[PDB]
Design a protein around this ligand. Structure first.
Ligand SMILES: Nc1ncnc2c1ncn2[C@@H]1O[C@H](COP(=O)(O)OP(=O)(O)OP(O)(O)=S)[C@@H](O)[C@H]1O
Ligand SMILES: Nc1ncnc2c1ncn2[C@@H]1O[C@H](COP(=O)(O)OP(=O)(O)OP(O)(O)=S)[C@@H](O)[C@H]1O
Lengths: 544, 264, 603
């Protein structure tokens, strides 16, 4: 029934992209939508078509889309073949193409998966994966369908490779002979699509704090190549196939062989068809958001004292410091970074840099922000090195070439990259930051590779004064132990003190106690640590 | 000079001798219909001559012999040109076209001799919202007109009253807000997750960090509320019963939903 | 194309019997030039062949390599029927083609283009040595069906020799730096060099290749057995190591013939900066460049300025050099954090995966005939400092290393943003003591942009107004018209020349004009130089050497290029002496005030 199962899939899918998939008209786009997609595609050379998954769900009550999702890799060739029967009708691109290739790429899936959610049960299925790229590989052309030439018949064979090992026919389909001599490969009449392999790793939001983030390697084929960039968060979408790796020997052991031939050793690798990398636009962000949540924002923005209601609600545990809490609330809300006249581009981000006496709860702000600010990173600094902080150069065996490691700065793009104990960081690593402060971009010329990657990253700091605690006696000049530039580039400064009192220390002690008295978690601030996030994700778009 | 310098047709007719060639070249390499933007072909023919070549040269080619091409302008605002022939070429046809073109140029020469191979005109075709800003409310302490008496207590005497509704109103807002969220959740777990024994913590931590890392985020315990609401508004399939910690959830059986979502 | 015997005939109608403009066969000359030169390589003037027979030219798309392989053998028999000796002289001759209109940049290559002909620009990033490439496994070494005695699992070993060897030099070509948009790593393409084209190119130098675009695999499997490493490789067929409209240069001259150009350029040199005319002046000077002049007599002296910008926090120096990166033609921005001296200059390595010697152009090499922009000098290791000092003095990079010997040329200027030791300028204290850079490399530079931040009640107010207005101005077909023209209105709010004009201007300048001098003032400027020498011996220690003098003319020639004179002028030489003398003045101690009068005899 699986033959006619794939054929019913074909019928249903051809039917879906046949009729309209979008009901809108006279306000959005025309009723027929994927016909318009095909028309756009025909004039240009897109070579692939993206289709919603929601609409697939809305086609046959999801049953069609469900079937496509659960088992997918069986239908990729099935659906790709079904597509022609459509496109041959309307857009005669295919005979004029002289080639018959279309990456039917899905997108907007309802359920992203953390990478540790990947199993083998999801084999051959369709899935979307959030994560952070790292160490892209240079694009290499990959054979897709080749022309094998017989050794004596010299006939053409449209043999299809499966990214496993050199495939080959068994009898020369030219019925003149049924030879088994190795048909001579041809590269010309062989459509090959280049692919780029990137090592994706789990982000911070989903990993339980304190655990090492698992990784994996994913492969990008088709036009999806080159769409990645070290540091950019992405939400890939595609199959979850397995690639044979002869390199697995020893410690596992028991693994079987193809004898009734040699051991088939395997390893999982996502293969993504479509890439999304995002992360006056209120025209976009608003109408994108449904009318309901507009009421919630409407509330949290039309209230009078939000700017106060917010600032005393950024550090529920911390006691007071209404100066610094302000400094942070402004951090997560960057500037505009709008470039000048074509001459140059100037920075649009803020870098608050606390420096405080002992027990000032300066590490709490960080180990909070880095857990509340999106795509952030916490590094003790002195344990780390300058090379690690900006970018690393490392060698890869794929092409025997040098390439880039994203590092804290590049994988901290568009998020706060907090740091601890600058003073402890010897200058050898203090230096490697400057370009990620004002010029906003890192530039590296090592081991032959010259490149420059933009790191639009807010930074922070928590270094302690020179003598641990700093003499009120002494001045401030010979008291911070940091040079002029890095003292300037910090567009805030907070030398936090710590002094004695009664009408303060009593309150502080009562507060800490109430904290340690779990039952007395009256700490509830006006705005939760969640609605603050959505309110920001709105306010990030005004560019006054 | 005025009579013979106008015999510079070679410096323009040669443009027709090679343009079609590279044009044909593009035509014989581009299966997209070979749409042409002068901002690429113009440098191409430039290199082909190394001379300055600007659109005016194509305009002079149009002026001398306007039928051998189409000169329409693209919707983006760029003037293009394609071939009139319905197949690629037969180089003898191209040769005869170049011959008749130089013959047309000589006819121009005779019938003109003043005119320095002028250019022809182009064949032109015929051709608030909830922005939640507040730029005024932050003006100043304008709130100085109402010089009322203790009447303000009056207003305040009603304040507490509305505090009852307002609070509850805000409460209903979540009864509203969460509502819209669940409108997608019965297609979040549904459309991908057919593992029957799913628990609560895992499913929640799936909901958060799902598409809720896009424009519209959400919090964990809020996801728990979403689940409880889904179950309650559909106890037919979704059966949730707690063992020791965390409420395990039912075995999915994929109903239709909005028919009950209208019960907001 | 099997019947192509007749087609080869028809294309060999053009073979010898074509002439033009009073005879003089295009190839009747080439055949005898080969008979007398023995270069085993035919030229094919594509311009004339394009006129000859359109079908033959178009045949460079379907089977272009098959077409050319059929063509060149009959060209061989042609030069052999012309010279019956020639066939025995060489082993085989391959033709080369003149030029195409197809200028697909490296950023644009598609599967439609592969296996066809392509002409691309770029820069040779790095190259290798000659390969004896392999090219019943003829050149498989991955396909062995039953040619093994123990073929079940006992492995049989083939040799890698006794096999045909093709002259094979794999050159990495990357996109031209500067043109690369910021963020994107420049593409790499492996072009192939063969018998005649071997070693004809170096790294760091511009090239233009005309080869085909094969989808060929490499037997360095390294991944799986029946899966070679497939690279989209350019096969070279002609290499060129190397325009704008007339009335363009006409109105261009119309502008450049004014009197204000030498200062309108300055005031337009920097888009969003307040003050620092002196530093903008030096920037423009070392941007335009001067006429170099090889000296086989004593030592080749380059005519290329080298500005060191001794900065100070707050002063927009890095923004200046970022503007320069954008505006100039061959900018290579590299910061003293990722210095790794092996990176700045060229280096030679062995690749672990393929066991092949390569040598890779450095930042100085990657910038040749341009500007290399470095900053945070005092924040780099001293060994980088030593290598850069060597490079500046020889303006090139010789190399004689394990398995390789050559001499790359690195004319390219250097702009350098520095940072004084510790914090800012201490005081009027000497510049040398004020910086941890060595006296040799200090003297290697000619211009020293001394900037300083000083509190002022008023000048800072005006500057602030300026900067605020800067952050104010930052932020279909008719909308694009109304947008382009409004961007140009903002281009005019900074009243002097718009930018695109100025970049075309600098290109025009560094291309065409090469000014020189007259005898008249050169000995009177040596007189002024001697007067400087007496004012400097009155200063005690001082680096006043031949470099300090030659800088003057090296700047005056840049000023002439600014004026497009082809020969130095008075006012320009006075500008040059002013800039040099006061750049020196800034470096010195309290004497500076005395110096303002002491060496004032010039002004
Ligand atoms: N203002 C405060 N209110 C309540 N608790 C505080 C406050 N300041 C410090 N604490 C507590 O005291 C501990 C010390 O806080 P910090 O001084 O921030 O530690 P830290 O970040 O390691 O400081 P350094 O400079 O790196 S040694 C924390 O675990 C806090 O819980
Ligand atoms: N005339 C000016 N107009 C506008 N901005 C200016 C001007 N002068 C300085 N600036 C500022 O200077 C900034 C860049 O200065 P930089 O040259 O980067 O200083 P800096 O050399 O980076 O400091 P270092 O290297 O850490 S010592 C710009 O972003 C401006 O804010």
């Amino acid at each position: 029934v699986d033959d006619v199962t794939g054929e019913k899939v074909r019928e249903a899918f051809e039917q879906f992209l046949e009729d309209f998939s979008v009901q809108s008209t006279d306000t959005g786009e025309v009723e027929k939508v994927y016909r318009a997609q095909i028309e756009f595609m025909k004039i240009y050379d897109l070579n692939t078509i993206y289709i919603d998954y929601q609409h697939l769900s809305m086609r046959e009550n999801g049953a069609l889309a469900m079937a496509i999702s659960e088992q997918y890799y069986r239908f990729l060739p099935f659906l790709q073949k079904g597509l022609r029967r459509v496109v041959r009708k309307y857009a005669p691109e295919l005979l004029n193409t002289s080639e018959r290739v279309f990456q039917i790429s899905f997108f907007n899936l309802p359920t992203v998966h953390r990478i540790r959610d990947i199993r083998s049960e999801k084999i051959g299925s369709l899935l979307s994966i959030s994560g952070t790229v790292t160490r892209t590989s240079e694009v290499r052309p990959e054979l897709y369908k080749a022309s094998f030439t017989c050794d004596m018949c010299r006939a053409i064979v449209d043999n299809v490779e499966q990214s496993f090992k050199y495939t080959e026919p068994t009898f020369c389909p030219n019925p003149s002979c049924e030879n088994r001599a190795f048909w001579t490969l041809n590269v010309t009449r062989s459509r090959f699509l280049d692919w780029q392999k990137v090592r994706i790793q789990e982000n911070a939001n989903e990993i339980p704090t304190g655990s090492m983030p698992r990784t994996l390697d994913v492969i990008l084929r088709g036009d999806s190549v080159e769409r990645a960039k070290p540091g950019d968060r992405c939400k890939f979408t595609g199959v979850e196939i397995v690639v044979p790796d002869v390199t697995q020997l020893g410690l596992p052991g028991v693994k079987p062989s193809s004898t009734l031939v040699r051991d088939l050793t395997y390893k999982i690798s996502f293969l993504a068809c479509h890439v999304i990398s995002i992360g006056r636009d209120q025209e976009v962000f608003l109408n994108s958001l449904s009318s309901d949540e507009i009421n919630e924002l409407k509330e949290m923005v039309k209230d009078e004292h939000i700017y106060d209601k917010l600032v005393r609600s950024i550090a529920p545990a911390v006691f007071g410091h209404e100066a610094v809490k302000k400094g942070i609330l402004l951090q997560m809300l960057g500037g505009v970074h709008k470039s000048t006249v074509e001459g140059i581009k100037l920075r649009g981000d803020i870098n608050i840099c606390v420096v405080g006496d002992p027990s000032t709860s300066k590490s709490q702000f960080l180990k909070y922000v880095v857990g509340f600010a999106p795509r952030s990173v916490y590094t003790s600094g002195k344990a780390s090195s300058a090379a690690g902080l900006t970018a690393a150069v490392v060698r890869d065996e794929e092409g025997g070439d040098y390439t880039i490691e994203a590092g804290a700065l590049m994988l901290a793009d568009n998020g706060i990259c907090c740091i601890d104990e600058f003073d402890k960081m010897d200058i050898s690593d203090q230096v490697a930051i400057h370009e990620a402060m004002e010029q906003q971009t890192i530039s590296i010329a090592k081991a032959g590779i010259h490149a420059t990657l933009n790191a639009r990253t807010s930074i922070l700091a928590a270094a302690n004064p020179v003598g641990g605690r700093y003499n009120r006696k002494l001045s401030l000049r010979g008291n911070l132990n940091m040079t002029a530039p890095i003292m300037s580039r910090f567009d805030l400064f907070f030398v936090i003190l710590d002094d004695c009192n009664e009408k303060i220390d009593t309150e502080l002690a009562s507060h800490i106690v109430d904290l340690h008295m779990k039952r007395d978690e009256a700490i509830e601030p006006p705005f939760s640590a969640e609605q603050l996030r959505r309110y920001i994700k709105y306010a990030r778009t005004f560019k006054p | 000079s005025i009579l013979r310098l106008q015999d510079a047709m070679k410096f323009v007719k040669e443009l027709f001798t090679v343009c079609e060639t590279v044009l044909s070249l593009n035509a014989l390499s581009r299966s997209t219909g070979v749409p042409p933007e002068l901002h690429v072909l113009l440098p191409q023919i430039s290199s082909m001559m190394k001379r300055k070549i600007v659109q005016d040269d194509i305009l002079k080619l149009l002026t001398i012999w306007s039928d051998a091409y189409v000169v329409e302008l693209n919707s983006r605002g760029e003037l293009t040109m394609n071939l009139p022939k319905r197949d690629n070429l037969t180089t003898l046809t191209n040769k005869s076209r170049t011959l008749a073109f130089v013959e047309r140029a000589e006819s121009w020469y005779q019938q003109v001799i003043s005119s320095n191979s002028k250019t022809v005109l182009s064949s032109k075709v015929q051709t608030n919202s909830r922005y939640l800003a507040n730029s005024k409310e932050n003006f100043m302490y304008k709130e100085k007109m109402p010089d009322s008496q203790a009447n303000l207590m009056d207003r305040l005497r009603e304040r507490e009253r509305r505090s009852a509704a307002l609070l509850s109103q805000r409460q209903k807002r979540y009864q509203q807000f969460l509502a819209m969220k669940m409108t997608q959740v019965f297609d979040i777990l549904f459309s991908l997750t057919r593992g029957q024994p799913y628990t609560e913590t895992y499913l929640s931590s799936l909901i958060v960090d799902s598409l809720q890392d896009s424009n519209n985020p959400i919090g964990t315990k809020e996801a728990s509320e979403i689940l409880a609401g889904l179950q309650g508004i559909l106890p037919m399939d979704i059966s949730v019963h707690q063992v020791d910690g965390g409420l395990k959830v039912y075995r999915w059986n994929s109903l239709d939903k909005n028919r009950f979502s209208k019960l907001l | 194309p099997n019947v192509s015997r007749t087609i080869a005939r028809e294309l060999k109608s053009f073979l010898l019997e074509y002439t033009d403009e009073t005879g003089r066969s295009v190839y009747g000359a080439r055949i005898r030039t080969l008979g007398e030169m023995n270069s085993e390589s035919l030229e094919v003037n594509y311009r004339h062949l394009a006129e000859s027979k359109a079908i033959l030219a178009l045949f460079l798309a379907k089977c272009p390599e098959e077409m050319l392989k059929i063509f060149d053998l009959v060209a061989m028999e042609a030069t052999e029927l012309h010279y019956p000796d020639y066939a025995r002289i060489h082993s085989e001759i391959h033709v080369r083609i003149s030029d195409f209109p197809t200028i697909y940049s490296l950023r644009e290559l598609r599967e439609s283009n592969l296996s066809s002909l392509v002409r691309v620009t770029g820069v040779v990033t790095r190259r290798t040595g000659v390969f004896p490439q392999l090219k019943q496994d003829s050149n498989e070494e991955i396909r062995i069906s039953f040619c093994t005695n123990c073929k079940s699992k006992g492995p049989f070993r083939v040799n890698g020799e006794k096999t045909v060897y093709r002259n094979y030099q794999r050159v990495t070509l990357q996109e031209a730096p500067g043109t690369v948009p910021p963020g994107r790593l420049p593409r790499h393409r492996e072009v192939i060099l063969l018998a005649d084209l071997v070693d004809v190119s170096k790294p760091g130098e511009e090239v233009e290749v005309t080869g085909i675009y094969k989808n060929n695999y490499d037997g360095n499997l390294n991944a799986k057995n029946g899966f070679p490493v497939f690279a989209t490789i350019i096969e070279a067929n002609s290499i060129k190591r190397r325009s704008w409209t007339e009335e363009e240069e006409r109105e261009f001259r119309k502008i450049s013939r004014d009197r204000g150009i030498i200062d309108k350029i300055i005031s337009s040199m920097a888009p969003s900066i307040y003050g620092h005319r002196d530093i903008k002046t030096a920037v423009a000077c070392s941007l335009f460049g001067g006429v170099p002049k090889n000296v086989n007599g004593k030592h080749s002296i380059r005519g290329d300025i080298n500005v060191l910008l001794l900065g100070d926090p707050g002063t927009a120096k890095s923004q200046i050099l970022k503007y320069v990166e954008k505006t100039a033609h061959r900018a290579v921005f590299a910061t003293g954090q990722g210095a790794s001296a092996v990176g700045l200059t060229a280096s030679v390595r062995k690749d672990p995966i393929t066991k092949e010697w390569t040598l890779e152009g450095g930042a100085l090499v990657l910038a040749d005939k341009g500007v290399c922009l470095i900053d945070e000098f005092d924040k780099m290791n001293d060994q980088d400092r030593t290598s850069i000092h060597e490079a500046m003095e020889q303006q090139s990079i010789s190399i004689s290393k394990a398995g390789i010997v050559t001499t790359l040329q690195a004319r390219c200027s250097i702009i350098a943003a520095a940072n004084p030791n510790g914090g800012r300028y201490n005081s009027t204290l000497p510049l040398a003591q004020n910086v941890s850079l060595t006296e040799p490399i200090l003297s290697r530079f000619d211009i020293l942009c001394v900037v300083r931040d000083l509190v002022d009640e008023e000048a800072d107010e005006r500057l602030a107004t300026f900067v605020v207005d800067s952050h104010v101005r930052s932020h279909q077909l008719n909308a694009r018209q109304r947008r382009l023209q409004r961007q140009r209105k903002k281009e005019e709010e900074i009243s002097p020349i718009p930018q695109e004009l100025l970049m075309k201007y600098i290109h025009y300048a560094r291309t065409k004009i090469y000014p020189k001098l007259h005898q008249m003032d050169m000995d009177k400027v040596s007189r002024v130089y001697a007067d400087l020498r007496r004012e400097s011996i009155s200063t005690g220690s001082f680096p006043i050497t031949v470099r300090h003098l030659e800088s003057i003319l090296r700047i005056a020639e840049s000023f002439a290029k600014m004026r497009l004179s082809e020969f130095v002028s008075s006012y320009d030489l006075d500008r040059a002496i002013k800039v040099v003398v006061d750049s020196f003045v800034d470096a010195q101690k309290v004497s500076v005030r005395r110096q303002l009068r002491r060496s004032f005899a010039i002004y």
